[PDB]
């Protein structure tokens, strides 16, 4: 099973310096050997075999080299220790012992399965045990994706290997916004190219001036020309013909310019132009990189070599009926509730296909019904994605006529299996606990399948029998049934419906209209989500026709196809169409930008094997930047039993084909396990000890060779292009906050670290759920991108944040930043903030600081209002010395105060205090009357309307995250908040009036508009 802790033994976080180890010799003898906690297995084996001579039957023992050790791990697995260089403290032993064995079987397979199992945080052998033929089919059938990916990697070796390991960090389009292009000197960029003139490793700079759209080779060519020598024009041209033997690298990190894209399309360069900063690049030989790249080999696993009448659904002439037999138990106080019943529904997504049907009410102590439930649905009319959603509810009818109904346990089942067979006969289903905050009696958004924990309420069911196996009809049979089923102001009406947000109201009249004009709809292909909701899914006549339209449907933008992958679109044809759009039009840039949502929608998939999982796995195995985050997002959810089987099987297939990255990922995983263990000691055994005592314990344990080996020389999980070198222990500290996070600092080991950052600072936090911050930071990045592409330079500077498990993760530290409270403490007055920024930015550079402060402040003012972020104060807002504002610890979004207080109003988390106003107004008396404030308001108005125009994207992104299990994001009614803050049911002008009134109410006046009252002009 999964490891209970990250400790060195069961119930012992850290082993004492010396420990007694029970050694089981192959002659049947037991030897107690005292070992040093960090001694390697080769040492222990040698010390044991010396000692073993002083014990009976020593003559039966072979040479020590004939044996390896085996023991039980904290995962209840008998692990064979083929790697004798590993230390005792790193073996994850359950108890202090080791059994001596002669190694047998496939050594190679066992070593790889251990490495995969270590990465995934679950033993591979657990999958071989699983009886479900769907799991065993998934494991075998997914290997074609693995083999495809690895073969595309060796296609154009070594360039194709380099392209996988170091993919180009490029924008989706080469076209630049006007305000970015105007920052250039007549379409030209000044770049600094550096050469490591080996030996002695000496640096030389070349202040080069070239066209922004120059392909990396064109940049290499100019560096060849501008080199210090003396040669003529014809001599400089022939030396340039010998080029293409070099590659461009970013100074300070592992970013490479390996593909022929305009220089300005590379995110580092684009960012450089924007910030006005000088791009520092390093020229290196193609061979220096290609030699460092190993050839990746995929091996077919052992499980691949081994093995683990029919009526159409449409010929079944009957209504749907399910027998609810009994439930083993329920946990209810018999004195507090009156009766228990089973609530059931037939769903397609989160929409019922017929009315919900309940069993009769029965006593708490006797959960037995033996009742056939009848549904108002004709069996042939069942759509392919139909599900049975049920729950055991309690009823408390004590106050008047008023009844209180609450779910006790829930479960969901696909009515058809992965092989299209309709469920038949008797079925036992283990129920799941009700998610905190969920008040609805059924949970149709929740996962399907039985609860793996069998010490839970088990509901016994019975499905109909039709003297045979019932299969859903084939496409050919569906297509023929669709044929059997068969002024221009209405063309303008369709255009208006297609522009509306995914959660805007659709009337029955609109549904009938959309369905009546389903054939003209093809002209406006983005109307497809609205049209699919108009379909009567409880009718095979309409569905068959919808399948015919979907097959020949024109492709839509990926940001629109993503909606068809959420919990509202369960149909495999609809999801298939959506996946094909992403295959064709989704760039690696955008895939990385929406990966988190794409991973969450995998949870919605009815089956393990589907087009989406195949698409995502292919991409993770074609692009290491995607692979890294694909791994960490799946790994972060491995504790969650609802999704751990699916994510574990997926992770297994990823780790089996990612090549050399498995070694780098295992280094990241073991660095994290040691940080989890260190923080667990401080939170548990050392919680009642002082900061000084905790720090002495910290410096002592961090200085251990086993700790220094694991936490130095690995890649940053926040950004794998960042190398974490030697730990700078004098900079490492425990924070005074409640969860006691670690503030860690590493050296950047890059030969040119001084041109990027010499130190990498990261916060490790154990105890807090980091998914909300993770989602908020991602939305801020998408908002800033919309703004920049529209001409608004509202710099947000969102720090990296990664959830690595259950309330555990990494938060990137923002360099040279100070909380508003830290500035206020150094001074008392409302001018203290503006005074600090004047002292930090003297003379000429003063205006740029006020401008940066104003721009960042406006971005945050609009972003926090739209999102409903956790309330702002002087301790969760920071300012950099350059003026850049950064908001930290968002924690909560949307209507998080809806239940707690009955008040219905949109909050303004970020109210600009007199102190912030004094900065923007450059120390003026009446702040709101200045030209600076007027310009700041205009930035807010522009930023707000820009996000409102892109509302469908933000609504889709939140809709895709409903699977996650974030408490503030459980239903579409939670997403209703951004529909209010973005005033989507109002006109563009009314929405701006709305935003202005919200700012006016919170700031007690001052917010005006240069535009007129009647028409905004």
């Amino acid at each position: 099973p999964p490891r209970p802790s990250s400790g060195e033994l069961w119930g012992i976080h850290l082993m004492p310096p010396r420990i007694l180890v029970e050694c089981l010799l192959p002659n049947g003898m037991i030897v107690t050997l005292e070992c040093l906690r960090e001694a390697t297995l080769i040492t222990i084996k040698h010390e044991l075999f010396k000692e073993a001579r002083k014990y009976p039957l020593h003559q039966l023992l072979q040479d020590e080299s004939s044996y390896i050790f085996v023991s039980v791990t904290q995962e209840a697995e008998r692990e064979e220790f083929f790697d004798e260089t590993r230390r005792l403290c790193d073996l994850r032993l359950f108890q202090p012992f080791l059994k001596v064995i002669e190694p047998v079987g496939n050594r190679e397979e066992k070593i790889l399965n251990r490495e995969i199992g270590f990465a995934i945080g679950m033993p591979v052998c657990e999958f071989d045990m699983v009886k479900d033929p769907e799991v065993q089919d998934f494991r075998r059938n997914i290997l074609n994706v693995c083999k495809e990916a690895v073969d595309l990697r060796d296609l154009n070796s070594p360039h194709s290997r380099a392209m996988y390991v170091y993919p180009p960090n490029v924008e989706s389009s080469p076209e630049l916004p006007k305000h970015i292009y105007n920052k250039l000197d007549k379409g030209q960029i000044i770049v600094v190219i550096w050469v490591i003139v080996s030996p002695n490793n000496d640096k030389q700079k070349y202040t080069l001036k070239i066209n922004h759209d120059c392909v990396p080779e064109q940049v290499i060519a100019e560096a060849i020309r501008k080199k210090t020598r003396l040669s003529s024009e014809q001599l400089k041209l022939c030396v340039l013909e010998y080029q293409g033997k070099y590659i461009l690298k970013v100074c300070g990190c592992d970013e490479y310019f390996l593909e022929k894209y305009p220089l300005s399309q590379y995110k580092y360069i684009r960012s450089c132009i924007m910030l006005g900063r000088m791009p520092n690049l390093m020229l290196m030989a193609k061979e220096s990189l290609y030699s460092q790249l190993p050839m990746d080999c995929f091996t077919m696993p052992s499980y691949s070599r081994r093995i683990s009448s029919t009526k159409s659904l449409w010929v079944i002439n009957s209504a749907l009926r399910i027998k609810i037999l009994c439930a083993t138990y329920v946990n209810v106080n018999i004195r507090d509730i009156d009766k228990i019943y089973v609530r059931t529904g037939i769903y397609h997504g989160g929409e019922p296909l017929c009315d919900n049907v309940n069993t009769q009410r029965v006593p708490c102590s006797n959960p037995r019904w033996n009742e056939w439930l009848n549904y108002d649905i004709y069996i042939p009319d069942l759509p392919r994605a139909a599900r049975l959603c049920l729950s055991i509810c309690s009823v408390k009818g004590r106050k008047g006529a008023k009844e209180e109904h609450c779910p006790l346990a829930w479960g969901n089942i696909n009515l058809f299996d992965y092989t299209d067979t309709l469920v038949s006969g008797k079925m036992a289903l283990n129920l799941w606990p009700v998610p905190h905050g969920l008040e609805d009696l059924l949970n149709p958004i929740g996962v399907t399948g039985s609860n793996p924990n069998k010490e839970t309420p088990c509901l016994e069911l019975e499905f109909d029998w039709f003297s045979s196996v019932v299969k859903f009809p084939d496409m050919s049979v569906i297509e023929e049934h669709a044929n059997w089923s068969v002024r221009e102001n209405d063309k303008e009406q369709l255009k208006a419906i297609s522009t509306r947000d995914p959660l805007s109201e659709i009337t029955e009249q609109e549904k009938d209209f959309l369905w009546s004009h389903r054939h003209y709809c093809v002209t406006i292909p983005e109307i497809l989500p609205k049209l699919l909701l108009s379909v009567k899914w409880n009718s095979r006549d309409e569905v068959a026709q919808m399948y015919c339209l979907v097959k020949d449907w024109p492709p839509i933008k990926p940001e629109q196809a993503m909606e068809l992958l959420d919990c509202n679109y369960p149909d495999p044809m609809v999801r298939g169409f959506a996946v094909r759009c992403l295959e064709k039009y989704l760039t690696d840039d955008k895939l990385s930008q929406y990966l988190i949502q794409l991973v969450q929608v995998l949870k919605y998939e009815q089956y393990l094997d589907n087009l989406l999982v195949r698409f995502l796995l292919k991409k993770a195995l074609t692009n290491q930047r995607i692979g890294h985050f694909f791994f960490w997002h799946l790994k972060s959810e491995m504790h969650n039993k609802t999704v751990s089987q699916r994510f574990g099987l997926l992770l297994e297939s990823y780790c089996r084909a990612c090549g050399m990255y498995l070694k780098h990922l295992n280094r990241q995983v073991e660095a994290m396990e040691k940080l989890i263990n260190l923080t667990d000691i401080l939170k548990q055994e050392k919680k009642d000890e002082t900061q000084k005592v905790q720090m002495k314990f910290l410096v002592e344990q961090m200085r251990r060779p086993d700790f220094m080996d694991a936490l130095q020389g690995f890649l940053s999980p926040l950004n794998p292009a960042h190398q974490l070198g030697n730990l700078r222990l004098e900079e490492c500290r425990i924070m005074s906050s409640a969860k006691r996070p670690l503030w860690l600092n590493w050296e950047n080991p890059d030969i040119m670290s001084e041109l990027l950052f010499q130190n990498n600072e990261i916060m490790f936090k154990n105890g807090d759920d980091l998914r909300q911050d993770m989602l908020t930071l991602q939305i801020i990045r998408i908002m800033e991108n919309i703004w920049q592409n529209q001409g608004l330079d509202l710099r947000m500077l969102p720090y990296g944040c990664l959830s690595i498990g259950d309330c555990v993760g990494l938060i990137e530290v923002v360099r040279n930043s100070h909380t508003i409270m830290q500035i206020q403490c150094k001074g008392f007055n409302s001018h203290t903030l503006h005074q600090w920024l004047k002292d930090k930015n003297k003379g000429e550079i003063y205006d740029a600081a006020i401008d940066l402060f104003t721009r960042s402040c406006a971005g945050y003012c609009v972003a926090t209002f739209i999102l409903g972020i956790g309330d702002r104060h002087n301790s969760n807002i920071m300012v950099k010395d350059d003026g850049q504002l950064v908001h930290i610890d968002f924690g909560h979004f949307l209507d998080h105060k809806k239940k707690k207080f009955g008040y219905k109003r949109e909050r303004v988390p970020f109210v600009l205090t007199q102190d912030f106003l004094i900065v923007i107004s450059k120390g003026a008396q009446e702040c709101t009357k200045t030209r600076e404030f007027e310009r700041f308001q205009e930035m807010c108005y522009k930023a707000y309307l820009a996000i409102r125009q892109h509302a469908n994207l933000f609504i889709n992104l939140f809709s895709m995250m409903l699977g996650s299990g974030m408490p503030e994001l459980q239903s579409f009614d939670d997403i209703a908040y951004i529909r209010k803050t973005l005033a989507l049911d109002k006109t563009e002008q009314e929405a701006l009036e709305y935003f202005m009134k919200q700012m006016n109410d919170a700031h007690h006046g001052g917010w005006t508009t240069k535009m007129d009252w009647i028409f905004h002009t």
Binding site: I30, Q74, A76, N331, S394, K396, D440
Partner: protein
């Protein structure tokens, strides 16, 4: 068409989300009319879904008023195949049983106090529920690891037995007392250790039986608070709405 804004089914300036709470788990035929996002919107419950029918329904308009359009389908209604039955009435006036603003305000302060205290107890119980559930999972993994450990140590006794049987046979015939004693001493140490591992599993099995019992009791306590907490919020929210309506309105 007897009344206007007096009608029990009309609700006015209330969101779709509010209507979704009012129609949740209701029988086919339940309905209410509200103001549109603009013109009104009729929301009818049919087949487990809420159906939005806009009031401008079809182009040849035979309805004189909003109350005339509703009462036409309330009595007899396919042109689909559903007639307006039970309307949601403005029942909600009964929940607040106080006359003046002072008495209502005093009762709201009481309900909100009770609600925040019950919310704090629910969250505390939920943290205990989570922690207990997590520790039960750890003990279940640790028991499996014990079973595997005990199997290995038992295998070791068997191995000791197979390999020593013929040697003890020879040493007894060769008269080596010291050699037989050294073998049985090691075997005793092995048996002493398996006894200790078995007792450790036995203790863990007891702690898990006790923590599994605590869990069921935490689950029971939460299944009792949940309905009472929801009802308390509903009351609180109803008294808040009463005060908003009774007080000076913008």
């Amino acid at each position: 068409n007897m009344s206007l804004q007096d009608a029990e089914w009309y609700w006015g300036d209330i969101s779709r989300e509010e209507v979704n709470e009012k129609l949740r788990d209701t029988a086919d035929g339940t309905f209410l009319v509200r103001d549109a996002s603009t013109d009104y919107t009729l929301t009818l419950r049919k087949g487990g879904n809420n159906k939005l029918i806009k009031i401008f329904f079809s182009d040849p308009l035979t309805f004189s008023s909003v109350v005339e359009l509703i009462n036409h389908y309330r009595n007899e209604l396919a042109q689909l195949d559903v007639k307006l039955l039970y309307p949601v009435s403005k029942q909600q006036d009964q929940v607040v049983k106080e006359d003046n603003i002072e008495a209502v305000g005093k009762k709201l302060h009481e309900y909100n106090t009770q609600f925040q205290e019950k919310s704090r107890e629910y969250d505390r119980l939920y943290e205990e529920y989570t922690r207990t559930s997590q520790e039960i999972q750890m003990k279940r993994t640790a028991i499996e690891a014990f079973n595997e450990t005990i199997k290995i140590f038992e295998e070791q006794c068997q191995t000791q037995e197979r390999y020593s049987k013929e040697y003890i046979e020879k040493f007894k015939r060769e008269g080596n007392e010291k050699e037989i004693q050294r073998i049985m001493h090691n075997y005793d140490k092995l048996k002493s250790r398996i006894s200790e591992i078995i007792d450790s599993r036995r203790r863990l099995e007891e702690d898990l039986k006790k923590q599994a019992a605590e869990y069921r009791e935490i689950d029971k306590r939460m299944n009792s608070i949940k309905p009472d907490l929801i009802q308390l919020r509903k009351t609180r929210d109803q008294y808040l709405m009463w005060l908003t309506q009774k007080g000076v309105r913008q």
